[PDB]
Structures are given as C-alpha cells and as structure tokens.
Structure 1
Amino acid sequence: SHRKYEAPRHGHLGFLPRKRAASIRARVKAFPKDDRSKPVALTSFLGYKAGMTTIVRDLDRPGSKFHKREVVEAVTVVDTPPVVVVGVVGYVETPRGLRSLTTVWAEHLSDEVKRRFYKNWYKSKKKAFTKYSAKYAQDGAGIERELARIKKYASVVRVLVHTQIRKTPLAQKKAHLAEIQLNGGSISEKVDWAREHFEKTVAVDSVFEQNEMIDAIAVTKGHGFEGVTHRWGTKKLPRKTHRGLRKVACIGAWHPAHVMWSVARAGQRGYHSRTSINHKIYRVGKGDDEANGATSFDRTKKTITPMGGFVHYGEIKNDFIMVKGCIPGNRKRIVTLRKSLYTNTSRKALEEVSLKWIDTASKFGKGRFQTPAEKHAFMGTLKKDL
C-alpha cells in the first residue's frame, strides 16, 4: 500500500555511486565552449586550498534591504602559484569521441613534475624523459614534426601544466600535472602558444580576474564508512528501536525481491569528485605583494595569511585566489578552478565587489588581533618581550 505520508527522497541519485574518487585530483569533465576569436588562454588553473577567512564589503544590490550596507562574507583562499607549461596534447574528433593523437613535451622537465612519474623517486635512476629530451638534439625535427601533426589534426588543443608544490608549504614535493584546454582560436595559434610557453610559467592573473564567476572542481573531504543517518540524512529511528536506530527501517518492499539501488545504504561518505559552479572571485592577490590582505579602506600592511598561519596549511607566499563562500575539498587539497561554462548575467554575477577588510586574526582559536603590531598595541609590554 502507498507510503501513507509523502516526503521527498533522501539524497540526490545523480551523485551516485557514493564511492571514493579514482584520483585525489578531480577531473575537469567539461571545458568552456571555445570562442575562436579571443586570444589563446588557459580555461582553468590548478591551486591548493589553503583555508577560509571572512571579509567585509559594501553590498551593491539595488532593491535589497542591504543595498550599500556592509556585509560579512566567508571566503575560501586558494594558493595559486604559477603553473609550469611542460606539454601539449592534440585531440582529434572521431565517431567514438575525442582521441589524443599525440603529446609533445617540453625539453626540460623539473624534478617537481618528474616526481609525478615515479612511485619510488629516491631510489630510482630518474631516467624519465631522458631519451625524449634528445629529440631536441640539433634542430628539434621530431618535435616540430609532432607539433605540425597537432596543427594538421587535433581539433582540440590542451596544454600539460604542473603545479609548483615547492612554492607551497605542503610537504608533498610531487607536483600535480593536468591537461588544461586552450581556448582562443586558430588551432595553429594554440599550438604556437603551447610551444612558446614550454618550460614557462603561467600566472593565475592571466587566467582569472576580479568579480569573475568560476567553478571549483575537487575531491571532497573523506569520512570513511558512514551509516545511512549521516550519509543520506535519513530519519533517526526511535529510541525504543531494537538492533539500533541509525538505520533505514524498511530497505524494500517484498517485491521486487531485491534491495533497490535507490535505497539508502551505509557506505563510503566523502572523497567524491564535485564540480561546484558560480563562485565569485573576490581577490586575485599576488605573493610578491606585501599588504596582500590590505584594502583601500583598511591600508594595514598585512598579507592574506592569518596570525599564526592558515591552520594545517601554512602561510600564503604565492599568488592566490580568494573566492566567495566555500568550495569542495579540504585544506592542502589540489583544486581545479575553471572558467564558467556559460555567460552569467544575473546581477549576482556582474557585481563588482570591493573588499573593505579581510580578517587575519588567528584561526587557531578565538583570535582577537589582526596583526602582531595590533596585539602589541593592545596588550602593552609583556615579560618575555614587547
């Protein structure tokens, strides 16, 4: 008989299976549609989630109860040092989909990216790309032949880039290598851009700008095996329930005489690939710019790094992307920031945000001070120093 009281199902069947992602770096499964009139540019970027903080800004939203008023907003900081271009892949269209025709690599690959090709780097003889780099012996005839093939074919061009983890506080030391689609016309010009940028760095400001809507693609934080109550949000069973209450009472009707795929079951929670869209960039800050965390309203000469450092991450010393709100993945995780797949004109996008103040109080507690100078000014002289 019927359910006797209607209620929406628990969870989204489109995010199935709730299994562990096959990689710690979530795949970009779609790049922006290519507009072959614009200049050649990366469609995405690689960064590392540093942490969260809060900003204050005046809201520019006519008709709102908070128009021209100050609002406090959570922001996520993504450490984004320049990525190194080390390769270029050509993709030909086939009746079976896109197929990589060939890949041309840079002549010199740094140990950062060479470590990606090894499970035991320290005891290896580090032979990776040693025979390939000889293809640049005298004139690079083989390299130019492969690039000519990419131009003659390969309706889609993607560059191979890798992060510079040595510039992050992470202990990993093994770089993240990814394909980023080159948008901007003239497949020939895409290949020329890739070849010229071989062994060269691309900074995050050449890809993203202030107020832009971007998408964050990352593997969520892992939580291991989870019961249905927190994995799917099902109702806790009553206290009187024998055999436990963090369960789904009826996992199926008599017929079909099978548990169905749509029934909440205990299993892995977290560590899933997610692609969350429409996160507005609030800052495109630069590592070389001391007073990274300053605004035109604050002027306090401070970097984005909170007092004591980003908890479990470290200090931001590179270029960084501050997006509004939160993004999937935990701190220290590699994230991919990609340009929006559509042209959003909604007055939520297209809003020009100007930060008034960025919180740099310690996130290791109820941080009361923005700067060590401010802590000294409030507390006066202490016994050890100050």
Structure 2
Amino acid sequence: GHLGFLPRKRAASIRARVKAFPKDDRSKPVALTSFLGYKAGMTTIVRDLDRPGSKFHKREVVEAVTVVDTPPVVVVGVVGYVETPRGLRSLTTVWAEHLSDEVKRRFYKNWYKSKKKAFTKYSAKYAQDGAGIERELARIKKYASVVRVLVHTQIRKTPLAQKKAHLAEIQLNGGSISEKVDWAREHFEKTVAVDSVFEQNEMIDAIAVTKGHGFEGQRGYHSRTSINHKIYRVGKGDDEANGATSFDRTKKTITPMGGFVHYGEIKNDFIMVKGCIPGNRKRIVTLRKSLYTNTSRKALEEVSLKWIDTASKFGKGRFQTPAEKHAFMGTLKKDL
C-alpha cells in the first residue's frame, strides 16, 4: 500500500489531535477556527440538487450519509502562544474561575477516591478585588502573536455517559489581539453554540482514530484524515421534526423508533455529511474548516433535500413514524 502512512503501529491517542489551522485574517470578526463532534449513527438520504451540466442535474438522487452528534460546547480559558525560532510556546493557561464537574473530572483518573481539592488555590484565589488574570492576560495582550482558547464538552448532555469531558483548544481568526483575547475573556464561563460557527454547503473535516480490530502490523486504530465532506444539514438539537426537509413536511425524530443502534435520542444539534466519517461508532471526531479558500462552482452549490431516513435500521428498516407505522399495522394482537 501507500508509504504515506509510516510507521505501522497504533494511534496512541483515543481522541485525535488537530494538526492544521486556517491561516488567519486581521480584518475578520473573531472566529472560531474549528470544532469537534461525536459521530453517532450511519444513515441514507434521498434528495435532489442543482448541478448544471452534470448528469444528475435537477434529478432525484439517493446516497448514504453519516450523522454526528454535536453538543453545544462550553469554554473556560485562553492561552496565547508566543512564537519563537524553535516553535510556538505557551505563556499561561487561564480559566473560568468556576469549572463544570466533568472538566474537574479530567484532572483525576480516580475520581471517587480523590479529595476534590483540585482548583481551590487557583479558582478560589481569583475570588478577590481582582488582578487575578489581569497581569497575565495583559501580558498575552502584549506578546503572543497567535491565540488559542480552551474548549470542553458537556457529556452529561449526551446519552453515552462517561461523566468525563474532553479538553481541546481552538484558535481565533479575528485580529488586533485585543478583541481576540477580550472576546473569549467575555466568553469565560460561557458556552458557544454552533450557530455562528458553520453553515450549510461548507466543506470541512472530521477525522479520528479508526476501529481497533485486533492483532494478527496492527491493523486499524489510526487517526486518518479525510477532507472535503459537504455538510448537507446543520442540525439543531431543539428542532422539532428533526428530519423536516424541503419536501417531506411530516414530523419525524431523527432518532428512529426504539432508538438508534446503541443510542438514546439526540439532545443537541448534529451535522449530517455525505460519505464516510472515519473510526468506529460512538466516536469523538475533529472538524477543521477548509484550511483555505476553496471557492468554485463545486463548493458554491446548494443542497435540496427530499427525504431523511428516520426508519429504525436495526434489522431491515421498514416504517418511519409510529403514527404512520400504527396506521399500516392497524390493531395488533392486544392493541385496539
């Protein structure tokens, strides 16, 4: 096979890492340069599209897709990175002076036996007349060409409960670092939804480790990188009729009847994308937006759904909604 990927052995990390970022621009708003999802479930969608000159033009089309569960994510702290003729370097990590439980849980491998004394010095000491982050943060103001921001999920808000929340950082594409740093300073002890982050017809990336199988080198369980995935539908986790298209106009929960395979329903937004999102199921995945300007007739297009698959795909997928399901079944044995 390719000598691209060498050497052979496993990806040492359960969560992958982000090895690139979109360059930056000084004249933009402060922008959230990337985000990370949870792939939950595979499915298939029918739709039609506008692609002039292609043989599918104005022509009803069917293709499978991938869904990714996406909790709106909560932000604690900022670290600016100085640049040095070696590499970057951190200056100081900062936080929200109140942290959620789970991010506390990231700092203990044994939670129950521990004393939960973690932050008291740092998070308590900031309670005061101030200056807590003043000196350091203004230092970031002076130094630190590039700036990143701590981001961490709420997994109590996901049906798979490990109680423990991951940490990551994301850059900021704004400029004149003051309204960068102030930005997230304003966003300390806050959350940031996916609204202002992405929108449809935008190519991005989501990649992660892939499906550990076993030992016969060691096959799989690598974080590979698959770019160019067109988001068909930007979900909203409060949206009734999850799968409401430009066609269907009937009520369906994107979580099927009886639930997803190994899942409860969807409490937060999601991204449906074509093709494949690497890994095995139940996965935490990385999302990097284009790294550059891709603009072309290919990426400027506009998706038009027909029907989204809400069927329960355990066994052969058959019905869709329990109302229609129970109209076609009619009365069962004990029903009515």
TM-score by length of 2: 0.96
| Offset, 1:352 | 0.8
What does the per-residue CA deviation read over 1:26-58, in whole Å, with 9 as the maximum and x for residues that have no partner? 100111110121111211112211111111111
Cα distance in structure 1, aligned partners of 2:128 and 2:255:
47
Decide whether the 8 Å contact of 1:46 with 1:337 is kept in 2: yes
What does the per-residue CA deviation read over 1:212-235, in whole Å, with 9 as the maximum and x for residues that have no partner? 100112111111224xxxxxxxxx
CA gap of 1:33–1:384, structure 2 versus 1, over 3 A, is: farther
| Offset, 1:296 | 2.3
CA gap of 1:199–1:379, structure 2 versus 1, over 3 A, is: same
CA gap of 1:18–1:384, structure 2 versus 1, over 3 A, is: farther
Shifted more, 55-64 versus 86-95: the winner is: 55-64
Decide whether the 8 Å contact of 2:36 with 2:206 is kept in 1: no
| Offset, 1:176 | 1.0
CA gap of 1:347–1:379, structure 2 versus 1, over 3 A, is: same
Count of aligned pairs: 336
CA gap of 1:225–1:345, structure 2 versus 1, over 3 A, is: same
- Larger-Rg structure: 1
Decide whether the 8 Å contact of 2:50 with 2:301 is kept in 1: yes
The secondary structure found in structure 2 opposite 1:201 is strand
What does the per-residue CA deviation read over 1:122-150, in whole Å, with 9 as the maximum and x for residues that have no partner? 11111222211123222330211111111
Cα distance in structure 2, aligned partners of 1:70 and 1:50:
26
Decide whether the 8 Å contact of 1:46 with 1:334 is kept in 2: yes
What does the per-residue CA deviation read over 1:352-373, in whole Å, with 9 as the maximum and x for residues that have no partner? 1022210011121111111111
| Offset, 1:345 | 2.5
Cα distance in structure 2, aligned partners of 1:161 and 1:22:
22
What does the per-residue CA deviation read over 1:256-278, in whole Å, with 9 as the maximum and x for residues that have no partner? xxxxxxxxxxx211111122111
CA gap of 1:140–1:354, structure 2 versus 1, over 3 A, is: farther
Q: CA RMSD in A?
A: 1.3
Cα distance in structure 2, aligned partners of 1:324 and 1:215:
12
| Offset, 1:59 | 2.3
CA gap of 1:17–1:313, structure 2 versus 1, over 3 A, is: farther
Which residue in 1 is equivalent to 2:2? 12
CA gap of 1:352–1:327, structure 2 versus 1, over 3 A, is: same
Percentage identity across paired residues of the two chains? 100
Shifted more, 158-167 versus 317-326: the winner is: 317-326
Decide whether the 8 Å contact of 1:84 with 1:200 is kept in 2: yes
The secondary structure found in structure 1 opposite 2:47 is strand
Q: Which ranges of structure 2 fall in alignment gaps of 5 or more residues?
A: none
Decide whether the 8 Å contact of 1:47 with 1:163 is kept in 2: no
Decide whether the 8 Å contact of 2:49 with 2:302 is kept in 1: no
What does the per-residue CA deviation read over 1:231-258, in whole Å, with 9 as the maximum and x for residues that have no partner? xxxxxxxxxxxxxxxxxxxxxxxxxxxx
Which residue in 2 is equivalent to 1:156? 146
Cα distance in structure 2, aligned partners of 1:315 and 1:191:
37
What does the per-residue CA deviation read over 1:274-300, in whole Å, with 9 as the maximum and x for residues that have no partner? 221110111111111111111121111
Which residue in 2 is equivalent to 1:381? 331
Shifted more, 80-89 versus 18-27: the winner is: 18-27
TM-score by length of 1: 0.84
Which residue in 1 is equivalent to 2:183? 193
The secondary structure found in structure 1 opposite 2:208 is strand
| Offset, 1:101 | 1.3
Decide whether the 8 Å contact of 1:32 with 1:339 is kept in 2: yes
Cα distance in structure 2, aligned partners of 1:89 and 1:343:
27
Decide whether the 8 Å contact of 1:26 with 1:274 is kept in 2: no
| Offset, 1:18 | 2.5
The secondary structure found in structure 1 opposite 2:264 is coil
Which residue in 2 is equivalent to 1:176? 166
Decide whether the 8 Å contact of 2:201 with 2:299 is kept in 1: yes
Cα distance in structure 2, aligned partners of 1:18 and 1:307:
42
Counterpart pick for 1:280 among 217, 225, 230 = 230
What does the per-residue CA deviation read over 1:324-374, in whole Å, with 9 as the maximum and x for residues that have no partner? 221112221111212111211243321110222100111211111111112
Cα distance in structure 1, aligned partners of 2:280 and 2:296:
29
| Offset, 1:114 | 0.9
Decide whether the 8 Å contact of 1:293 with 1:305 is kept in 2: no
Pairing 1:351-362 to 2, within 5 Å after superposition:
351-362=301-312
| Offset, 1:306 | 2.2
What does the per-residue CA deviation read over 1:291-323, in whole Å, with 9 as the maximum and x for residues that have no partner? 111112111111221222221233111111111
What does the per-residue CA deviation read over 1:57-89, in whole Å, with 9 as the maximum and x for residues that have no partner? 112111111110011122211111111101111
Cα distance in structure 1, aligned partners of 2:111 and 2:8:
33
Q: Which ranges of structure 1 fall in alignment gaps of 5 or more residues?
A: 1-10, 227-266
Which residue in 1 is equivalent to 2:132? 142
Decide whether the 8 Å contact of 1:295 with 1:357 is kept in 2: yes
Cα distance in structure 2, aligned partners of 1:63 and 1:41:
36
CA gap of 1:87–1:384, structure 2 versus 1, over 3 A, is: farther
Decide whether the 8 Å contact of 2:49 with 2:304 is kept in 1: no
| Offset, 1:385 | 2.4
